Each structure stands twice: as C-alpha cells, then as structure tokens.
C-alpha cells in the first residue's frame, strides 16, 4: 500500500514548461523514482489537503 | 523599562546565536551546472564546521565578518532598566543604589 | 530545435541553402534535410554549451534572438571549408560574441513570445538562516 | 515592432528595400513582406536583449531613438552577405554601440511621444527597514 | 524640433538639401518634407538620449548649440550610405563628441535666447535633515 | 556677437568671405549677411558652451582673444564640406583647444578693453560660518 | 567513440573522407576504416585529456557539442601535412579553444539527449564537520 | 493584483432574483467598486474560506 | 474661494529667462498646477505682504 494522497482539489506546484502552476500529480508521501523532479513537483499543498488509501 | 529590557535581551540572544563561525560566500564561474551549484552550496554550508575542503581554482570562497562588537551596549541598557525598576518599586537607596553593608545599633 | 529549415530558407533564401546543402548533384537540385538537421543540431549544441549555466537546458520556448543566433551558426556549419575573412565566418563570430555576453551576464535572454525565460536556481542558494529568538515568542 | 515597412521605406527609399528584399525576381519587382517582417523581428529581439535589464520588455510605446536603431538593424539584417567595410555594417555597429551605452547606464532611453519609458524595479529593492522605537510612541 | 527645414537650407544651401532629399526624381526637383522631418526627428531623438539625465526632456526653448548639433545630425541622417572618411560623417562625430561632453558634465548647455536651460533635480536630493535641539527652543 | 562681418572681412579678406558666403551666384558677387550671421551665432553658441561654467553668459564686453576665436570658428562654419587636413579645420581645432584650456582653468580670459571679465560665483560658496563665542563679548 | 564514420561523412561529405583517407590508390576509391578509426581515437584521446578533471572518463553518453568537436579534430587528424593557414587547422584551433573553455569552467558540457553529464566529485570534498553539542541533546 | 478571492468553491451570499444562494465563489476583498453592494455579496462565508489570489 | 494674495506692491522671485527678478504673479497660498514652477515663482515675499479675498 502507498500512504500519501491529496484529494481535496488542493493546489500543488507542478512545473510544465518554464513555469510552475497549480496541478495534482504524484501527490504521494513515498518516493522511489523522480525524487529530484518530485521535489519541485511535490511541493506541499497550498490549500486544504486530505489523504486516502488508493492501495494501488 | 520592561520593553527596553525585553528588546535588549532578545537582541543579545540573537547576536549570540549569530556569533561563532563567519559568513562565507562561494563564487562560481559561468558554465557551472545546477548539480555543481548544489555541491558548492553544501560545501560552503558545511565548511565552517569542517576544518578543511578543496575547490577548483576557478571558484572562490570569501570569509566575511559575521557579527563583531560586544555585549556592552545591551548589558548597559539592561542595567539601566533594572535600576529604574528597582527605584520605582522599592526606592533608590537600598535596591538600585544599594545601601551596602555596615552594622550597628 | 531553435531554428528550422523554413527559418534558414527565409534568412538566406532557398537558393543558397540548396547550393550549400546539396553535395552529390552538380548543379544542386534539392536541399538535403539530413545535413541541415545536423547543422542545426550542432548550432543548438553550441548554444546550450553557452547557456547551460544560467538557464534550464530543455527550453520550452525559443527566444527570437536565439532563433537568429541558431540560424547564423547553422548556416556557418553548412560550409565544409570556411576561411577567416569569409563574411559568414564574421557573422558567426559576432553571434558567438553575443552568446558569450549572455553567458557572462552582460546581456539578458529576451522574451520568447510574451513570457520570460526560466533562469536556473544557481543564485538562489543560501544556507537556511538560523534566527531563533526572533519569532515573536 | 519598433519599426515598420513604412519606416524602412522612408529611411532607405523604396527602391533599396525592393532590391534587398526581392530574392526570387531579377530584376526585383515587389517587396517581400515576410522577409522584412523577419528582419524587423530580429532587430527587435537584439534590442530587447540589450534592454531587458533596465526596462520592461513589452514596451507600450516606441521611443524615437529606438525606431532609428530598429530601422538600421533591420536593414543590416536584410543583407545575406555583409562584409566588414560595408558602410551599412558600420552603421549597424554604431547603433549597437548606442544600445550598449544605454544598457550600461551611460545613455537614457528618451521620451516616447510625451511621457517617460518604464524602468524596471531592479534598483528599488531594499530589505524593509526595522525602525521600531522611532514611531512617535 | 531643435531645427527646421529653413535651418537646414541655411546651413547647407537649398541645392544640397534638394539633392540629398529627393530620391524619386533624377535630377532632383523638390525637397521632400517628410524625409527631412524624419531626419530631424531622429537627430532630436539622439540628442534627447544624450541629454535626458541632466535636463528636462520637453525643452521649452532650443539653445543655439543645440540647433547646430541638430542640423548636423539631421544632414548626416539624410545620407542613405555614409562612409567613414566622408567629411559629413566626421562632422557628425564631432557633434556627437560635443553631446557626450555635455552629458558627462564637461560642457554646459548654453543660453537659449536670454535665460538658462532647466536642469533636472538629480543632484538636489538629500534625505531631509534631522536637527532637533537646534531650533532656538 | 563676439565678432562681426567687418571682423571676418578684416581677418580673411572680403574676397574669401564673398567666395564662401555666396552660394547662389557663380561666380560670387555679394556677401550673404544671413549666412554670415548664422555662422557667427553658431561660433558664439559653441564658445558659450565652453565658457558657461566660469563666467556669466551675457557678457557685456568681448575680450580680444574671444574675438579671434569667434572669427576663426565662424569662418570654419561657413564651409559646407570641411575635410580633416584642411588648414582651416586645423585652425578651428587649435581655437577649440584654447577654449578647452580656458574652461579647465589653465588659461585666463583676458582684459576686454581695460577691465577684467566677470567670473561666476561658483567658487564663492561656503556654508556660512558659525563662530559664536568669538565676537568680543 | 564520440563520433563515427557516418558522422564524418555527414559533416564533410563522403568524397572528402575518401580523398583524405585512401592513401594507396590514386585516384581514391574506398574509405580506409582503420585510418578513420585511428583519427577518431586520437580526437577522443585529446578530448579526454581536456575533460578528465571535470567529468568521468568513460562517458555513457556523447553530448552533441562533443560530437562536433570530435568530428572536427578527427578530420584535422586525417591530414598528413597541415599548414597554419589551412582553414581546417583554424577550425581545429577553434574547437580546441572550446575544449579549453570547458576545462577552465567557462563553458558547461551540454545535455547528451535529455539528461545532464556526470561531473566528478572534485568539488564535493570537505573534511567531515565536527558539530557535537548541536544535535538536540 | 487581487488582494484575496476567499473562494474555496463557495461565495458568501450571491443573492439574485429575490433569492439568496451560496455558490460560484465570488468573494473579493477590495474597495475598487460596489463596496456598499460588496457588503451584501460578502459578509457570509458559511463554509471554510480559502484565499488564493489570482494576481489580477 | 482662494486664500492667498499679495497686494502690497511686494517683491517676489519670478524667473523670466535665465534670471529671477521682482514681479507679482500667482501669489497664492493654494496650488493645483505648476507646483514645481510655482515654487521658484512663489518664493515668499521680500517686503511687506498683505492678503485679500479675490474670490475668483
């Protein structure tokens, strides 16, 4: 099981091309790959964040 | 006087926190990648605790003064405020300007 | 890909690109796309060499000055033999001077279409800042 | 767009623009608008490269000196081959010198029509200023 | 408008202005007012570039030296092709040297007709001056 | 008006003034007063540019050296085209060197007829001088 | 192997490679693979000489600029006799200048295909850091 | 810029056609215009408030 | 009504061309235009000054 999910329509910093804008991607508290990119992508939320059990 | 003493004590605590190692700034030439920038930053960050380190001749680290002075101004302000408080509360004959020793009938 | 075959044709006319790109037919008849692609790739590689320390490599947008520089370098690369006094060589040298000025922080990379480029985080780094006793306790 | 086709025609006469812009007809007959547009865009890109650190990029107005500089650079860009001793090259070099002087803070960007340009906030930055005990308590 | 068509004619004779201004008729017959206006505007723009940091831009009066400088620069601008050894180019360079000397505070902008020009308030700025305890209390 | 038409005629002979002033008749017949007036005005404007920082502008008297300098500059201004090796250009350069030496405080502006010129109050300024307790109380 | 025979053919055309590689047949008929391999190996050895102090030697990927540099050096090595004014020699000198700039930390080694190169750990070294009494005891 | 939006996918009180509803997230904090009507539109964030300036 | 007038034949510094000489112009204590030029023009008086109610 993976612990870590953000499902409150919450905002996170995801960078597409030359800018970082609101979007929900990985949104997990565990990492095995893309750690250096995840840091920029996984900036903790701006707004209310609540976690669930995807169990994927 | 309470506010004066509080400000002086907080400022002294901050200055004591900054005291110790010097601030040192690293400089890198054009064409230094982000990974090398992060490595230089970590090296500079840990250089104060670490006695020795090596960098390319093209880089440079400058050790600048951190906080040079004394506790004299802060302590002077604290003493002034404490003397004022002592005089206002218990009088300026025994507490602030202490009556000193000396017995007798 | 800061420049394309269309950009090269527009800047130097299709005849000159055909003449300097067709190496197997005399007189030239068609433009060799592979040779032009390699020249453009080499120009982009040189520009990235110059710009790696100040901006992100995989730029999402191409600034116009970057387009002009890439076109000039690509055309200069399409010449098998290039002498010192050839004017194309002088143009390439001027463009390289512009690139060096950009790298040394004397020129700024301009707008792409409406937004700024993406500078790297090289200058951002600071230790962290220890300032306890100053947090309104 | 600091200069237009009308400005180029006015500065260099329509005959010269036709001669240096029409590459497919010999003798030239018409002015190619696409080539002129690309040359003007390249001139604007170079000027923005020079002016990005002191003023806002998307200028709402074009200063007159900027118009002259853009016209000169655009005309210099319309030459496929440009030698060192060509007088047009010397004019381009002088205009680039003017741009560099502006960038290094030796020349000021003049009035557009009646109002000043919009300098960037680079010099404005100061920490904030902590001056408690001085607010008439 | 530091100089007018009358000033150009007076300084360089009407024949030379006609010859360097009429581009469509060979031999020249009339002076093109639009071309002369653009040249004068460009000269004024360059002069303002040089004078923006020491005086107000919209000058209410034109100093005589400014008239001579504007006339020279305008005439130099009316030449489509201007080589380095052309004497008109040398005169333009001398006038630009005069302008640079004025900007660097080595020469003063002279009287317009009877009164002084209007310098900017760049040097005026001082903090404010806190001198309580010195107001005859 | 540091020099007049009489001074120009006396210094350079009436024939040369006629030759360099009459632009409409070939061969020249009369001296154009307007052209000479403009040349003299331009010379005076340049001299004022050089002398504004050390003396008052509207001089009530004309020093003799000023007359010679004005005559030389006015004659140099009457030439539409003036090359570098023309001796008149060299004389103008020498006079400009004299003016620059005067401005930089290496040469003094001589007597007008019997009295001194009127220097400006630039050096006079001092704060005021606070010397209470020293007034024989 | 920063470049291959295909790269050399693409950059300099197959005819020139055949002419400078076939030493036993006159006129040349085939490209000698051994000679080309040795030239490419020598170019790679020189590049490694220049890049050993900043990156790992056995690079897993070849940056594009490295490909261009290797191709140029390999072609320059295929000439038995190379004079100073030969343009190929000048190109080799320019590429060596690029390599020296990379070594001295003025240019960065660009992207290979999408990822960064692998810099060496030369700058990483620090003593260790003794900071007891600061571990939240 | 925009001082605040206070949207959280909820307006304070958007009253139209004689009926007062709660939706469309039309919360503003500025005195640009309609301050008197801004009092009526605002002043009732029944649900949570999340402020994410749009920099308009 | 405008408060501010100088009607004692008083002297004020008015600059015409390259010099500032005695003259009476604006002479008011209120300003809405030409403030930068008024400062030079509205140098307080040298001699006796008395004010009136123009009410213009």
DSSP letters, E82-104, are --TT-HHHHHHHHHHHHHHHHHT
Exposed (0-12), middle (13-18) or buried (19+): which is G131, by Cβ within 10 Å? exposed
E14, E17, E20, E24 alpha-carbon torsion, rounded to 10°: -70
Tell me B24's DSSP state: E
Is residue E36 within 8 A of residue E17, CB to CB? The reply is yes
User: Cα angle at E75 between E70 and E81, to 5 degrees?
Assistant: 135
> Regarding beta strands I20-22 and I13-15, do their DSSP bridges make them parallel or antiparallel, or are they unpaired?
antiparallel
| Cis-peptide, bond into residue C27, ω within 30° of zero | yes
Q: What is the resolution of this structure in A?
A: 8.0
Chain C contact set for D53 (CB, 8 A): 108
Q: Which residues of C touch A17 (CB under 8 A)?
A: 60-61
C69 Cβ contact partners less than 8 Å away, ≥ 6 residues apart: C2, C43, C47, C95, C98, C99
Using a CB–CB cut-off of 8 Å, the residues of C that contact B are 49, 52-54, 103-105, 120-122, 125, 127-128, 130-134
Q: Distance from A11 to chain H by nearest Cα, in Å?
A: 10
Residue E81 contacts D, CB cutoff 8 Å: yes
Whether residue D2 lies within 8 A of chain E, CB to CB, comes out as no
Nearest to D73 by CA among C65, F110, G79, B65: C65
Distance from CA of E21 to the nearest CA of F (A): 16
* Residue among D49, D53, D80 minimizing CB distance to C65: D49
Distance from CA of E115 to the nearest CA of F (A): 9
Q: What are phi and psi of A22, to 5 degrees?
A: -60, 130
Residue with tokens 């600061």: G134
| C-alpha torsion sign, points F88, F93, F99, F101 | negative
Task: Count the neighbouring beta carbons within 10 Å of the beta carbon of residue H56.
Answer: 7
**Is residue C25 packed enough to be buried (19+ CB in 10 Å), middle (13-18) or exposed (0-12)?**
exposed
Touch G-I: 3+ C-beta pairs under 8 A: no
| Chain G residues within an 8 Å CB radius of B43 | 123-126
Min distance E104 CA to chain D CA atoms (Å): 9
Is C90 touching G (CB cutoff 8 A)? no
Give one word for D72, left, alpha or beta, with left for phi > 0 and alpha for psi -120 to 50. Answer: alpha
Q: Closest chain E residue to F39 measured between Cα atoms?
A: E11
Q: Tell if the CB–CB gap between E114 and I15 is shorter than 8 Å.
A: no
d(CA C50, CA C48): 5
> HSE of D48 in the Cβ direction (CA atoms, 13 Å)?
25
Q: What is the rounded distance in angstroms from the CA atom of residue C59 to the CA atom of residue G70?
A: 26
Give, as one character, the DSSP assignment of residue C35: H
Give the Cα separation of E86 and E61 in Å (integer): 32
Which residue of G105, G116, G122 is in closest CB contact with B32?
G105
D85: left (phi over 0), alpha (psi -120 to 50) or beta: alpha
- Of A13, A15, A18, which to mutate for an interface test with C (greatest number of C Cβ within 10 Å)? A18
Nearest CA of chain C to the CA of B18: how many Å?
8
Give the technique used to solve this structure: cryo-EM
Can you list the positions of beta strands (E) in C16-94? none
Cβ D40 vs Cβ D72: under 8 Å: no
* Cis peptide bond N-terminal to D27, omega within 30: yes
Mutate to test the interface with E, among D75, D110, D113 (most CBs of E within 10 A): D110
Q: Do E111 and I18 touch (CB under 8 A)?
A: yes
Length of chain C as a residue count? 137
The values of phi and psi at residue F80, to 5°, are -65, -45
Nearest to F46 among E65, E88, E116 (CB): E65
- Which residues in chain D touch residue C102, judged by CB atoms under 8 angstroms apart? 49
Distance (Å, whole) CA E137 – CA F12: 72
**Distance of alpha carbon D16 from alpha carbon D9, whole angstroms:** 8
What is the crossing angle of helices D87-103 and D33-51, to 10°?
A: 40
Give chains near F: 3+ CB pairs under 8 A.
E
What is the Cα–Cα distance from D23 to C39, expressed in whole angstroms?
23
Judged by a CB distance cut-off of 8 A, whether residue F84 touches chain E is yes
Q: How far is C93 from chain D (nearest CA, A)?
A: 12
Half-sphere exposure of G104 (CA within 13 A, CB side): 7
Q: Rounded to an integer, what distance in angstroms lies between the CA atom of residue D116 and that of residue C58? A: 37
From E68's Cα to the closest Cα of chain I, the distance in A is: 21
The Cα E122–Cα E105 span in angstroms is 13
Contact F44 E67 (CB under 8 A): no
Query: Nearest residue of C to residue A16 by CA position?
Result: C60
- Decide if C68 and D57 are in contact by the 8 Å CB cutoff: no
- Check: CB of residue C120 under 8 Å from CB of residue B34: yes
Distance CA A38, CA A34 (A): 6
The CA-based dihedral angle spanning residues F38, F44, F45, F49, taken in that order and rounded to the nearest 10 degrees:
160
State the sign of the Cα–Cα–Cα–Cα dihedral E87, E88, E93, E99: positive
> In D, which residues are within 8 Å of C64 by CB distance?
41-42, 44-45, 48
Q: Hey, what are A19's tokens?
A: 């800018």
The alpha-carbon gap from H20 to the nearest alpha carbon of chain A, in Å, equals 26
Cα(E64)–Cα(F42) distance, integer angstroms: 7
3-state secondary structure of F24: coil
Q: Which single residue is written with the structure tokens 């992100």?
A: C56
> How far away is chain G from the Cα of C24, in angstroms, using its nearest Cα?
9
Yes or no, beta carbons of D116 and E57 under 8 Å apart: yes
Sequential DSSP letters for D9-63: HHHHHHHHHHHHH--SSSS--S--HHHHHHHHHHHHHHHHHHHTTTB-SS-SS--
**CA D43 to CA G36: how far, in whole Å?**
44
Q: How far is C8 from chain B (nearest CA, A)?
A: 28
Which of C137, D120, D19, E3 is CA-nearest to residue B14? C137
The two tokens of residue I3 are 């408060």
Q: Do G123 and B50 touch (CB under 8 A)?
A: no
F90: enclosing H helix or E strand: helix F87-103
Contact B58 G119 (CB under 8 A): no
Q: What is the Cβ-side half-sphere exposure of residue G20, based on CA atoms within 13 angstroms?
A: 20
Strand partners, I54: none
Is there a contact between E65 and F83 if contact means CB atoms under 8 Å apart? no
Beta-carbon-side half-sphere exposure of residue F17 (alpha carbons within 13 Å): 24
Angstrom distance (rounded) from CA D74 to CA D78: 6
Tell me the sheet residues that pair with H20: H15
Query: Under DSSP, is residue A27 helix (H, G, I), strand (E, B) or coil?
Result: coil
Return d(Cα B39, Cα G121) in angstroms, integer. 9
Q: Using CB atoms, which chains have 3+ pairs under 8 A with C?
A: A, B, D, G
Which chains would you list as touching A if contact means 3+ CB atom pairs under 8 Å? Answer: C, H
Report residue I36 as tokens.
């930068």
Q: Is the separation of the CB atoms in B63 and B4 below 8 Å?
A: no
Tokens of D129: 């200023």
Neighbouring chains to H with at least 3 Cβ pairs closer than 8 Å: A
B30 neighbourhood in chain C, CB within 8 Å? 53-54, 103-105
Chains I and A physically touch (3 or more Cβ atom pairs below 8 Å) = no
Residue carrying structure tokens 């490419």: G40
Check contact D-C (3+ Cβ pairs < 8 Å). yes
* CA count, 13 A, side-chain hemisphere, G5: 15
Which residues of chain E lie closer than 8 angstroms to D65, CB-CB? 42, 45-46, 48-49
Residues of chain E contacting residue F38, judged by C-beta atoms under 8 Å apart? 10-11
How far does Cα C55 stand from its chain's mean position? 13
Round to whole Å and give the CA distance between C9 and C18: 9
- Checking G77-80 for CB contacts under 8 A at 24+ apart, the result is G77/G38, G77/G39, G77/G42, G77/G43, G78/G17, G78/G20, G78/G21, G78/G35, G78/G36, G78/G39, G79/G20
CA–CA distance, D25 with D28 (Å, rounded to integer): 5
Q: Is the Cβ of C45 closer than 8 Å to some Cβ of chain G? A: yes
Is G63's Cβ below 8 Å from some Cβ in C? yes
Q: G29 near G21, Cβ under 8 Å?
A: no
Mutate to test the interface with H, among A47, A49, A50 (most CBs of H within 10 A): A47
Across the interface, do D48 and C111 touch by the CB < 8 Å criterion? yes
**Rounded distance between C-alpha atoms, residue A19 and residue C117, angstroms:** 9
Q: How far is CA H40 from the centre of its chain?
A: 9
Distance CA A4, CA G71 (A): 50
- The answer to whether B14 contacts C120, with C-beta atoms less than 8 Å apart, is no
Question: Min CA distance, I18 vs chain E (Å)?
Answer: 3
| Chain E nearest CA to F83, separation (Å) | 5
Q: Residue H50: CB partners within 8 Å, gap ≥ 6?
A: A47, A48, H6, H7, H8
């Amino acid at each position: 099981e993976v612990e870590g999910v953000f499902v409150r329509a919450t905002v996170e910093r995801r960078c597409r091309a030359g800018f970082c804008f609101d979007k929900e991607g990985q949104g997990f508290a565990d990492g095995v790959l893309s750690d250096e990119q995840l840091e920029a992508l996984e900036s903790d939320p701006l707004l209310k964040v609540e976690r669930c059990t995807f169990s994927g | 006087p309470y506010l004066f003493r509080h400000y002086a004590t907080s400022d002294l605590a901050e200055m004591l926190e900054i005291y110790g190692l010097p601030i040192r700034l690293g400089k890198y030439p054009p064409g230094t990648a982000d990974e090398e920038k992060a490595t230089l930053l970590r090296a500079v960050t840990g250089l104060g605790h670490a006695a020795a380190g090596i960098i390319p001749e093209t880089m440079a680290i400058d050790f600048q003064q951190a906080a040079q002075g004394s506790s004299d101004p802060f302590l002077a302000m604290m003493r002034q405020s404490e003397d004022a408080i002592s005089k206002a509360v218990l009088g300026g004959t025994l507490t602030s300007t202490t009556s000193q020793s000396g017995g007798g009938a | 890909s800061y420049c394309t075959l269309a950009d090269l044709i527009e800047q130097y006319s299709e005849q000159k690109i055909r003449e300097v790109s067709d190496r197997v037919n005399k007189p030239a008849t068609t433009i060799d796309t592979v040779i032009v692609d390699r020249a453009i790739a080499d120009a982009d590689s040189e520009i990235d060499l110059h710009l790696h320390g100040r901006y992100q490599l995989p730029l999402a947008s191409v600034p116009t000055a970057l387009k002009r520089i890439a076109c000039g370098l690509a055309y200069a690369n399409l010449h098998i033999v290039l002498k010192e006094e050839n004017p194309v060589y002088k143009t390439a040298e001027h463009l390289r001077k512009l690139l060096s000025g950009i790298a040394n922080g004397k020129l700024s990379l301009a707008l792409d279409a409406d937004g700024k480029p993406a500078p790297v985080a090289n200058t951002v780094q600071i230790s962290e800042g220890r300032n306890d006793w100053g947090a309104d306790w």
